[PDB]
Amino acid sequence: TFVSSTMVRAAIRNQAAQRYVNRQESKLERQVRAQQNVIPEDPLDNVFA
Amino acid sequence: SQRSKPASENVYLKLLVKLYRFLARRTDSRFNKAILKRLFQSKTNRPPISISKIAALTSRKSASSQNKTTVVVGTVTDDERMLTVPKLSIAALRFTKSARARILKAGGEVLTLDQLALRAPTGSNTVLVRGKKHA
Amino acid sequence: DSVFGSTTEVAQLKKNYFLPENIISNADVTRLINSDEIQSIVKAAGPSRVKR
Amino acid sequence: AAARPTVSIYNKDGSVSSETLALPFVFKAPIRPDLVRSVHTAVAKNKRQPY
Amino acid sequence: PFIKKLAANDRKTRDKALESLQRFLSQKKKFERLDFLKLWKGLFYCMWMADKPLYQQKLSDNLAALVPIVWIDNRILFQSTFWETMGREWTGIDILRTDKFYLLMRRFCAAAFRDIQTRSKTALLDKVVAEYNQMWMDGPFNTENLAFPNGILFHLADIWTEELRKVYPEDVPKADWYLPFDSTIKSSHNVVLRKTLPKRLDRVSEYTKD
Amino acid sequence: YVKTWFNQPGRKLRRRQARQTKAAKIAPRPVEAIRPAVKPPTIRYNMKVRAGRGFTLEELKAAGVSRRVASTIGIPVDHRRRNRSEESLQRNVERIKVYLAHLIVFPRKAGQPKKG
RNA sequence: UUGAGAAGCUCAGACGAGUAGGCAGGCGUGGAGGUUUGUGACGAAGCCUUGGGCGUGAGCCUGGGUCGAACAGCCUCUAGU
RNA sequence: CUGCCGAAGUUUCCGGAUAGCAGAAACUCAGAUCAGUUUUAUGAGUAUGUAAAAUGAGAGUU
RNA sequence: UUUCAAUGGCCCGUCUUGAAACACGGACCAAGGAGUCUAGCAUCUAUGCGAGUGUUUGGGUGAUGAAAACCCAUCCGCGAAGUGGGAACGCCCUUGUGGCGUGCACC
């Protein structure tokens, strides 16, 4: 019938364990999406350059 | 922050209100009156709409998206959950950098409300939409 | 152009910075109001300050 | 849109040169007097000494 | 021309670049569309920087008269790229500058009609008009793009018949002169454009196929 | 009792001058010692690699640097840490070896008595 | 017809007590950034005055007298206002 | 300093939760409803009540 | 402006209570003199960005004032993972009909 009082401490420690990794994955995916969401350069933006 | 005039201090929102004040007064379009009313509203009463919701609402039930412009007086954010963006023509106050790039790179055009007023001064063939006000 | 960049190209000297976009495209609102696109559909303008 | 394309360069003697620079995109940025004033109001308080 | 000099800040260099453009546009070699689009970016700003009404209505004549100088093979491309570069820059113009670009289209509308007449001497008129109607329908009067401003097309409707009568003062032959207007009234998705274009247009059925 | 931070810009400058004062004393050598690469001791961070305190005696022995000369050339020694896995041993031995590949050690004068 | 500080101009009708309370727009003071290519020993500031004027009002402008070195309008910021 | 809005001053349980009075916001809604009002006749007991006429006002709201 | 004539006209502020009254405070004048600063929380508005957002613990940097401004490595906080109906189209002399309905409320 349910777990030791220390297992609740293990439960919250496992919840926060993925906090760092999920932040790293979310940051990496955002950069990859932003890399692929690049507006193509207009062939006329540098006509007078 | 409503009713007579916008409480916003942006000069470019004041210029858009100037344009649609004329359109709402010198035409018989309830679209121009509706756009003018929503230009006066606060940021809380103009919730953002997503790229996914625009794609879903246009091709809804009977679908038949055709080429009607989608107008929202608010921000068009991006839904990274969806993988393929259809060809959409959207007019909005603001587009995010992700939403704008995804519409342009695979799809059609992003417009401002003054570019829309030149294309459809009476608002004809437009899909006016709103965001979910319930946060 | 490296300090600020553009609206579509990132600034070289500011990481992940793009120039802000405007909620209006042509800020000359008299050009839009007095354009052939708009003036061809408006109803005949009433008078200016009206007679009493 | 439709801004002036290029900018002329002036020599140290005050005469125009044959070289021009394309106008940078920052001069096309929105001019926001309300937003500049609000940021200036805050930034001007950042060198105050306590009393 | 080098395009950069065509948009220079002094009128002398812009005038010199225009004079050197006649040799450039006369070469008997094929020009890509992007090359003409880059050229019309400089030529647009040559007109955009024009100062006084006497100059900017003589400069418009110079640009319009530049069409017959272009080689026959890439003459349609020159006109097609002008109407593309005017469609994408029309809204960026301001009120104090539209009245001189309005005359630029009118001078270029007449340039197309004159070029049709010039080609009609050596070839059948129907073939030349079909070539131009393809250019008109693939560019400005195209219904597949909704971004082309209605101000260009309303102006074209207003001046279509009068600039045609100028090229043929005695009488004009029968051809599909108004085909782009009929095609775009019937098929365009712009309700405002298709509802008031017949009112603006002065289609004279007397010299069109019935 | 309120702790104000009006000296925050002053402390930034004071620490910068300490870095420059140190670099003035030790001209060609780095202002910091080389730190090892270790893994934080928890399931939340054990996938990250951070900087350690010093190199273990087994790391120094493998790389060829004795613990008595390691400190003289700017290699910290951690007698407490140990290599429980072969990956930590290889990650930090290579760090030492790359450090020794980029190192110019200036010679020192030695006293040589005339007689035997 | 020029009467687009569109935040402007214009037309019409109705209404007007007010405690607690609520909401707008303004007046004034010390200091700050900007501005008036600002005022000042040919007289700044202050003070006096049955001088004159402006505003519904808070207040402001001015003549004369006195006086002797500094001071103000506008946009914004600030508060021991 | 001026302008505008403007109470309650008490039912109910019980220092309050209220309600109610007075404003703000979010609405929809004249092809609709509302009312310190009078009615038509019959229901019950001149009064009282009823559903649907007259008069006025656009109203209902959260 | 001083005064005269005719008409009217109480002493303010507080407290009280039904308004009062009454009782309190006030010899006069000048100067000083009372909702401030800060840390939370919630609301509304504005602004920036937006499935993200937050540079200023700190580092870099700033030749002329360097407590400013400018730049950001790794973390971290928070966040996240049937009908009615606005608007528009096409018909209908118009009403009205037909196709299409966002938000929200019903099912």
Swiss-Prot record, chain A:
Subcellular location(s) of the protein: Nucleus, Nucleolus; Cytoplasm
Highest rank taxon of the organism: Eukaryota
Family, similarity comment: Belongs to the BRX1 family.
Job of this protein: Required for biogenesis of the 60S ribosomal subunit.
Protein name per UniProt: Ribosome biogenesis protein brx1
Organism annotation: Schizosaccharomyces pombe (strain 972 / ATCC 24843)
First and last residues shown, out of full length: 247 to 295 of 295
Curated annotation (Swiss-Prot), chain B:
Alphabetical GO biological process terms: cytoplasmic translation
Single GO cellular component term: cytosolic large ribosomal subunit
Phosphoserine modification, residue list: 4, 52, 124
Modified residues (Phosphothreonine): 75, 77, 122, 126
One term of GO molecular function: RNA binding
Domain of life: Eukaryota
Location in the cell: Cytoplasm
Keywords, in A-Z order: Cytoplasm, Phosphoprotein, Ribonucleoprotein, Ribosomal protein
Main location: cytoplasm
Subunit structure of this chain's protein: Component of the large ribosomal subunit (LSU). Mature yeast ribosomes consist of a small (40S) and a large (60S) subunit. The 40S small subunit contains 1 molecule of ribosomal RNA (18S rRNA) and at least 33 different proteins. The large 60S subunit contains 3 rRNA molecules (25S, 5.8S and 5S rRNA) and at least 46 different proteins. eL18 interacts with NAP1.
Function: Component of the ribosome, a large ribonucleoprotein complex responsible for the synthesis of proteins in the cell. The small ribosomal subunit (SSU) binds messenger RNAs (mRNAs) and translates the encoded message by selecting cognate aminoacyl-transfer RNA (tRNA) molecules. The large subunit (LSU) contains the ribosomal catalytic site termed the peptidyl transferase center (PTC), which catalyzes the formation of peptide bonds, thereby polymerizing the amino acids delivered by tRNAs into a polypeptide chain.
Additional information: There are 2 genes for eL18 in S.pombe.
Family per record: Belongs to the eukaryotic ribosomal protein eL18 family.
Protein name: Large ribosomal subunit protein eL18A
Organism of this sequence: Schizosaccharomyces pombe (strain 972 / ATCC 24843)
Name of the coding gene: rpl1801
From Swiss-Prot, chain C:
Regions that span the bilayer: none
Disulphide-bridged cysteine pairs: none
Signal sequence interval, chain numbering: none
Subcellular location: Cytoplasm
Remarks, miscellaneous: There are 2 genes for uL4 in S.pombe.
UniProt function note: Component of the ribosome, a large ribonucleoprotein complex responsible for the synthesis of proteins in the cell. The small ribosomal subunit (SSU) binds messenger RNAs (mRNAs) and translates the encoded message by selecting cognate aminoacyl-transfer RNA (tRNA) molecules. The large subunit (LSU) contains the ribosomal catalytic site termed the peptidyl transferase center (PTC), which catalyzes the formation of peptide bonds, thereby polymerizing the amino acids delivered by tRNAs into a polypeptide chain.
Assembly information from the UniProt record: Component of the large ribosomal subunit (LSU). Mature yeast ribosomes consist of a small (40S) and a large (60S) subunit. The 40S small subunit contains 1 molecule of ribosomal RNA (18S rRNA) and at least 33 different proteins. The large 60S subunit contains 3 rRNA molecules (25S, 5.8S and 5S rRNA) and at least 46 different proteins. uL4 is associated with the polypeptide exit tunnel. uL4 interacts with its chaperone ACL4 and the nuclear import receptor KAP104.
Family (UniProt): Belongs to the universal ribosomal protein uL4 family.
Protein name (record): Large ribosomal subunit protein uL4B
Organism of provenance: Schizosaccharomyces pombe (strain 972 / ATCC 24843)
Curated annotation (Swiss-Prot), chain E:
Database matches in Pfam families: Nop52 (PF05997)
Record-level GO BP terms: assembly of large subunit precursor of preribosome; rRNA processing
Compartment annotation: Nucleus, Nucleolus
Disulfide bonding pattern of the chain: none
InterPro entries: RRP1
CC annotations in GO: nucleolus; nucleus; preribosome; preribosome, small subunit precursor
Name of protein: Ribosomal RNA-processing protein 1 homolog
Species in which this protein is naturally found: Schizosaccharomyces pombe (strain 972 / ATCC 24843)
